[PDB]
Amino acid sequence: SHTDIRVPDFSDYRRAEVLDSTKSSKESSDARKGFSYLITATTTVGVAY
Amino acid sequence: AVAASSKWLEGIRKWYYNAAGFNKLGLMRDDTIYEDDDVKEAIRRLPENLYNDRVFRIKRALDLTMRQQILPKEQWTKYEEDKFYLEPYLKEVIRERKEREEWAKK
Amino acid sequence: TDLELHAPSYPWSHRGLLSSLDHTSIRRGFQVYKQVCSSCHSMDYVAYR
Amino acid sequence: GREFGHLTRMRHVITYSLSPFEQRAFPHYFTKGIPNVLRRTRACILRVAPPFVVFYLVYTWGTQEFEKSKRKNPAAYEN
Amino acid sequence: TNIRKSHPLMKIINNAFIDLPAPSNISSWWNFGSLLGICLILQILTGLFLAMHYTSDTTTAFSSVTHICRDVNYGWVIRYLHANGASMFFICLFIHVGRGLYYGSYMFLETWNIGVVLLFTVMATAFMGYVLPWGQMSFWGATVITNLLSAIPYIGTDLVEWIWGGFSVDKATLTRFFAFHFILPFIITALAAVHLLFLHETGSNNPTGISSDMDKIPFHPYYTIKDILGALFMMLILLILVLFSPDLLGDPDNYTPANPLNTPPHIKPEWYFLFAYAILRSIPNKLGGVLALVASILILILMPMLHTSKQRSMMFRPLSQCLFWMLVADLITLTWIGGQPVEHPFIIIGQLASILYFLIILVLMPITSIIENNLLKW
Amino acid sequence: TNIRKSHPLMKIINNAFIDLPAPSNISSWWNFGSLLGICLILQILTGLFLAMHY
Amino acid sequence: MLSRFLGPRYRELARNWIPTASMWGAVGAVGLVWATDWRLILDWVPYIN
Amino acid sequence: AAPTLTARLYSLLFRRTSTFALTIAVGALFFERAFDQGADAIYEHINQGKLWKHIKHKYENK
Amino acid sequence: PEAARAANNGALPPDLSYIVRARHGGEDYVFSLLTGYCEPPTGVSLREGLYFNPYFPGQAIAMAPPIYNEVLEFDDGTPATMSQVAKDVCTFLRWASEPEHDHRKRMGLKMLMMMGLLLPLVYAMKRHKWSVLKSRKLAYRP
Numbered sequence: 001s002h003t004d005i006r007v008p009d010f011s012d013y014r015r016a017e018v019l020d021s022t023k024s025s026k027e028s029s030d031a032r033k034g035f036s037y038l039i040t041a042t043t044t045v046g047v048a049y
Numbered sequence: 050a051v052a053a054s055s056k057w058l059e060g061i062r063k064w065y066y067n068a069a070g071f072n073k074l075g076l077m078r079d080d081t082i083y084e085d086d087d088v089k090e091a092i093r094r095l096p097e098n099l100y101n102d103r104v105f106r107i108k109r110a111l112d113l114t115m116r117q118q119i120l121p122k123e124q125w126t127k128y129e130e131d132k133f134y135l136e137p138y139l140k141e142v143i144r145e146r147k148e149r150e151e152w153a154k155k
Numbered sequence: 156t157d158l159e160l161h162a163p164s165y166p167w168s169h170r171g172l173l174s175s176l177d178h179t180s181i182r183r184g185f186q187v188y189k190q191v192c193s194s195c196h197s198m199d200y201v202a203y204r
Numbered sequence: 205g206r207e208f209g210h211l212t213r214m215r216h217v218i219t220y221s222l223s224p225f226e227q228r229a230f231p232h233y234f235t236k237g238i239p240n241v242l243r244r245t246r247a248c249i250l251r252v253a254p255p256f257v258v259f260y261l262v263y264t265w266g267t268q269e270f271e272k273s274k275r276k277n278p279a280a281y282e283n
Numbered sequence: 284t285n286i287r288k289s290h291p292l293m294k295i296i297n298n299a300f301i302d303l304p305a306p307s308n309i310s311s312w313w314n315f316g317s318l319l320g321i322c323l324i325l326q327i328l329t330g331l332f333l334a335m336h337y338t339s340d341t342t343t344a345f346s347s348v349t350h351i352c353r354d355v356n357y358g359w360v361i362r363y364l365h366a367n368g369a370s371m372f373f374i375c376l377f378i379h380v381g382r383g384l385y386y387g388s389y390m391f392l393e394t395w396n397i398g399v400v401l402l403f404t405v406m407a408t409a410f411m412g413y414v415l416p417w418g419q420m421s422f423w424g425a426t427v428i429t430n431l432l433s434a435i436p437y438i439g440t441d442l443v444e445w446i447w448g449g450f451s452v453d454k455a456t457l458t459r460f461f462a463f464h465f466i467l468p469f470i471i472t473a474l475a476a477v478h479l480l481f482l483h484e485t486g487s488n489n490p491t492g493i494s495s496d497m498d499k500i501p502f503h504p505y506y507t508i509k510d511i512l513g514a515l516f517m518m519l520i521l522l523i524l525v526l527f528s529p530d531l532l533g534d535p536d537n538y539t540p541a542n543p544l545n546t547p548p549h550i551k552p553e554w555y556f557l558f559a560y561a562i563l564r565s566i567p568n569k570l571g572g573v574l575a576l577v578a579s580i581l582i583l584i585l586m587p588m589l590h591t592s593k594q595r596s597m598m599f600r601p602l603s604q605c606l607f608w609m610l611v612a613d614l615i616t617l618t619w620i621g622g623q624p625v626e627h628p629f630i631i632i633g634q635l636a637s638i639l640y641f642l643i644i645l646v647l648m649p650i651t652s653i654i655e656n657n658l659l660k661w
Numbered sequence: 662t663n664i665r666k667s668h669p670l671m672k673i674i675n676n677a678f679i680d681l682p683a684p685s686n687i688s689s690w691w692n693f694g695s696l697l698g699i700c701l702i703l704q705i706l707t708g709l710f711l712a713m714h715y
Numbered sequence: 716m717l718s719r720f721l722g723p724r725y726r727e728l729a730r731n732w733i734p735t736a737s738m739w740g741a742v743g744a745v746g747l748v749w750a751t752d753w754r755l756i757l758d759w760v761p762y763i764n
Numbered sequence: 765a766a767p768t769l770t771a772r773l774y775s776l777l778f779r780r781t782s783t784f785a786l787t788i789a790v791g792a793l794f795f796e797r798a799f800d801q802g803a804d805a806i807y808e809h810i811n812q813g814k815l816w817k818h819i820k821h822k823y824e825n826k
Numbered sequence: 827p828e829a830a831r832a833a834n835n836g837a838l839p840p841d842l843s844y845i846v847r848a849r850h851g852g853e854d855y856v857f858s859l860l861t862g863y864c865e866p867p868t869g870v871s872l873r874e875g876l877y878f879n880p881y882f883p884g885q886a887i888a889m890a891p892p893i894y895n896e897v898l899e900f901d902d903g904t905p906a907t908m909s910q911v912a913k914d915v916c917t918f919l920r921w922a923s924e925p926e927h928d929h930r931k932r933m934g935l936k937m938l939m940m941m942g943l944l945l946p947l948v949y950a951m952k953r954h955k956w957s958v959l960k961s962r963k964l965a966y967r968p
């Protein structure tokens with residue numbers, strides 16, 4: 001059946017503190033998606049060469 | 050076709066099977082064949098369940114190679130359990146091409 | 156026509172990856188050019204400028 | 205002529221994937237990476253290295269029978 | 284309206300680079316095709332700068348090249364970009380051909396045969412440019428080719444007194460060398476567009492040899508970012524050579540001006556012509572020398588019909604991989620021998636390695652693939 | 662088959678110059694587009710001769 | 716391998732094309748004798764000198 | 765679940781994609797202010813008392 | 827060129843504008859030439875004006891030793907011994923061959939550290955896109 005299809009565990013890959021799957025996606029997206037996207041910040045100011 | 054030293058040659062065939070490494074990607078021998086116009090006609094003559102098994106084994110090995118990994122050793126294809134599933138369909142497609150060719154010169 | 160003698164390697168002060176030329180040893184080397192040679196040797200491509 | 209909805213026919217396979225922003229940048233780098241390149245190297249070298257070991261033994265013999273003939277002749281200069 | 288799919292110009296860009304289906308397991312050996320296209324554009328722009336200040340006259344050819352390195356502003360960086368960018372072109376080209384030979388990419392027949400034509404046209408282009416500065420290797424390199432080019436039996440001596448302008452060596456001599464060298468890189472560009480048009484009919488091969496129509500990914504963004512990264516890593520290595528060792532790959536003897544009177548102590552071409560030069564000097568004849576030089580590039584076109592294996596690539600063939608790197612270690616031997624003088628040890632080693640280059644491709648490789656078929660029971 | 666319609670290079674030539682649908686009452690005022698393309702090729706080849714001696 | 720060209724009636728196809736192919740070897744004997752003005756076979760016929 | 769300081773700029777400017785393509789222009793500034801402090805000053809320090817402007821104070825005495 | 831032969835025993839003296847760049851050994855060769863003049867070994871003979879130098883192609887050079895102790899006076903107070911003056915016509919004549927030597931090595935440092943910003947950050951952009959494919963899981967349910 002299709003009710004036997006569940007997603008396998010992906011906690012080998014997650015951003016470290018978001019693995020606590022009890023708290024819900026409200027404070028754990030305030031400060032999670034940006035510092036390797038500040039690596040996009042320096043890859044432009046440095047792309048100017 | 051030797052009868053006494055076909056134990057020696059059974060060991061060379063096992064050594065070459067392990068030194069080639071399609072078994073470590075979970076492939077069978079007929080999965081690795083080069084697809085010319087002859088092999089492409091034998092593929093579309095396969096029954097539905099054997100065609101579906103071949104598409105998944107190829108997709109899984111192409112995914113392992115993208116990551117530079119192999120399977121666990123308990124899931125490697127063994128030498129005595131490799132099924133030559135494509136070989137009877139390919140011999141018939143080749144035998145029909147020789148007959149259209151002997152007809153055209155005579 | 157048998158064998159050559161190849162020169163040894165001296166530790167010149169400009170033999171580094173970022174090492175400059177000594178500009179007082181250039182100054183004393185122009186005066187050995189213009190008092191010892193300049194009489195048998197030419198130097199067609201260098202000007203006073 | 206060959207675009208995405210026209211390539212093959214495929215049945216009964218399923219794919220699960222995560223967003224790039226839900227993943228950390230380096231899950232492992234040096235604990236996974238070092239033993240994986242040590243077995244990718246063990247599989248290589250007995251096919252690749254022995255031809256270049258034979259070029260080395262020909263370079264070393266060839267630049268040693270040139271120097272014995274370009275006038276290293278103390279006892280090969282007799283009356 | 285998706286304007287990427289309905290505009291007449293944007294359709295062509297989208298089908299060729301954005302929405303193109305590509306295999307997912309493509310290695311970084313597949314990076315060197317776009318590196319070759321970067322090296323070609325670089326040689327064209329830099330060469331168009333040098334051609335406004337060069338003079339093709341055998342009394343002022345050497346002096347117009349020293350002038351740009353000393354007088355013209357940024358002429359020294361642009362000249363050594365051009366000389367070192369040509370070594371960069373030839374190292375990517377030898378990686379590219381060795382890739383297509385190991386993985387079996389020659390089975391794309393129209394793509395492989397346009398490639399063998401492109402290999403001749405870049406080798407002839409680089410020969411003409413090394414004549415233009417007129418030092419003592421541009422002189423004794425030009426005469427060695429054109430007295431070897433008088434051993435063509437019926438039209439040979441007709442063709443040698445055409446390229447010097449009709450005379451021996453004079454001013455109008457390097458106007459013909461310069462005009463060939465100007466024009467051929469723009470024909471190389473047109474042959475590389477047709478080259479990719481025939482590959483668009485099948486898509487790419489992959490390291491397994493097995494068709495991958497069940498595992499495609501779009502070209503953007505996965506190989507647009509992987510090709511930009513490899514190009515930046517190539518511009519780093521090129522500038523390490525221009526700015527920290529600009530004379531490492533050249534020869535010092537080309538800083539002396541050409542003189543039929545004086546004498547050069549040795550004759551050594553550039554490193555990427557040294558393998559062909561070693562095959563020439565192993566044939567005591569001058570018709571059988573120019574034949575075996577042209578037959579060492581033209582043997583690539585027989586690779587589709589010499590293929591006797593059941594599989595396409597060498598990934599699963601361990602005996603064919605020992606022969607592939609015996610062939611690479613034999614082209615290293617022929618590069619070393621080509622820069623040595625002609626005495627006793629380097630004369631038998633040079634001809635026993637010219638035999639091995641043809642024995643591996645023509646005899647030992649098609650027999651080894653049949654032994655492998657028989658050990659797998661086809 | 663018809664190689665004018667299945668070869669990858671010959672398809673482009675056939676769609677652009679051979680099998681192209683064109684009106685039947687086109688005058689000789691419509692001649693001057695290909696005359697401009699002849700005049701451009703002529704100026705390029707002749708100019709590349711003058712630039713080796715200027 | 717190239718015994719695809721070996722049939723009992725395939726060599727019959729050479730018998731009906733070689734009378735056309737008997738001749739264009741004599742176009743090269745007459746066409747660049749025109750073009751590059753070869754003095755070898757201008758010695759041949761008294762029409763031309 | 766106290767996170768680290770990643771999202772300085774995820775919300776305000778680098779979300780509208782405006783400053784993502786503008787940082788090549790708006791973001792062109794003050795690093796040729798900052799890397800003279802590097803390459804130039806490292807260059808004159810490895811070669812100390814060897815360049816012209818080191819020794820030119822002698823014959824520049826008019 | 828013709829007066830130059832008869833003034834110098836038939837041998838023509840070479841131009842010096844490219845001399846270290848055109849030798850297999852550079853200023854190591856020019857230094858060992860000027861300070862390597864010695865006497866002929868017992869067995870060799872020489873011409874009328876022709877001198878023995880072991881670091882010259884075929885020991886016989888048509889060039890008298892042109893520098894010795896106190897050949898000139900420097901306007902620095904530097905003692906003008908034989909090794910000091912040979913060291914200074916190797917430094918000048920390296921500048922004469924390569925007048926861009928110092929500008930070359932200073933652009934090479936302004937390249938090596940403005941690639942050290944650009945390269946680790948195109949690599950992180952690459953690793954961000956490809957993590958979708960590197961984490962995928964596959965199932966087969968016939």
Ligand code: HEC
Nearest residue numbers: 187191192195834837838839840845856887888889892915
């Ligand atoms: C009055 C003569 C005379 C003077 C002074 C002289 N030379 Fe020479 N030099 C020669 C002659 C003659 C040759 C050509 C040598 C030959 O062919 O044998 C020569 C050749 C050379 C060569 C080239 C050797 C080679 O391998 O080609 C160098 C380097 C050289 N000289 C350095 C110097 C330097 C440095 C000075 C002075 C600071 C100097 N010479 C002064 C006569 C002179």
Ligand code: HEM
Nearest residue numbers: 313315316317319320383388389398399401402475487488
């Ligand atoms: C100036 C010369 C060349 C240029 C610009 C060029 C360019 C390219 C490019 C961009 C690709 C696609 C990407 C890739 O796989 O790397 C490619 C593929 C290919 N090229 Fe070249 N190439 C050149 C010369 C050659 C030569 C000399 C050969 C062979 C003799 C050749 C044979 C091939 C083949 C067979 C492929 C397809 C390989 C595959 O998909 O596995 N090319 N080329």
Ligand code: HEM
Nearest residue numbers: 326327330331333334337366369409412413415416465468
């Ligand atoms: C595939 C492209 C090219 C290659 C491989 C190539 C190669 C070379 C080489 C090896 C030299 C000798 C330089 C030296 O060692 O000093 C040279 C010189 C020269 N080339 Fe190129 N070249 C290419 C394209 C061009 C183009 C397109 C032009 C002009 C429009 C050009 C103009 C020149 C000029 C003027 C010289 C003489 C100046 C000099 O020697 O620096 N080149 N070329």
Ligand code: HEM
Nearest residue numbers: 684687689690691692693694695696697698699700701702
């Ligand atoms: C180097 C310059 C040009 C070239 C090579 C060129 C070439 C051509 C060619 C071959 C055609 C198709 C045949 C024809 O109708 O004559 C054409 C059509 C046309 N051209 Fe040009 N042209 C050039 C300049 C211009 C200019 C300056 C204009 C207008 C400002 C223009 C506007 C048009 C138009 C509107 C047509 C279609 C006319 C119709 O079908 O009634 N072109 N051109």
Ligand code: HEM
Nearest residue numbers: 700701702703704705706707708709710711712713714715
């Ligand atoms: C649309 C194409 C072109 C046009 C309309 C054009 C027009 C002209 C004109 C009017 C002159 C003055 C000649 C005189 O009155 O004495 C001239 C001169 C010249 N052009 Fe062009 N030209 C074209 C293309 C080219 C190209 C492509 C080149 C070089 C690759 C070239 C090279 C020269 C040179 C070298 C001169 C030298 C002066 C002379 O010969 O009189 N031209 N051109």
Ligand SMILES: Cc1cc(C)c2nc(SCc3c(C)cccc3-n3nnn(C)c3=O)sc2c1
Nearest residue numbers: 299300305313316317479482483487507510511
């Ligand atoms: C950074 C950059 C940009 C561009 C615009 C670019 N363009 C190519 S050529 C694409 C292509 C075509 C047109 C036709 C058939 C096959 C492939 N192709 N398929 N796989 N690979 C590796 C290929 O090059 S590389 C490259 C790199």
Ligand SMILES: Cc1cc(C)c2nc(SCc3c(C)cccc3-n3nnn(C)c3=O)sc2c1
Nearest residue numbers: 406407409410413423424427551552553556559
């Ligand atoms: C297809 C093809 C065509 C040609 C014409 C060709 N020629 C050579 S060897 C030329 C040479 C010699 C003999 C001596 C000194 C220098 C150079 N020489 N000339 N140009 N370059 C870059 C050099 O190294 S292989 C080759 C292959």
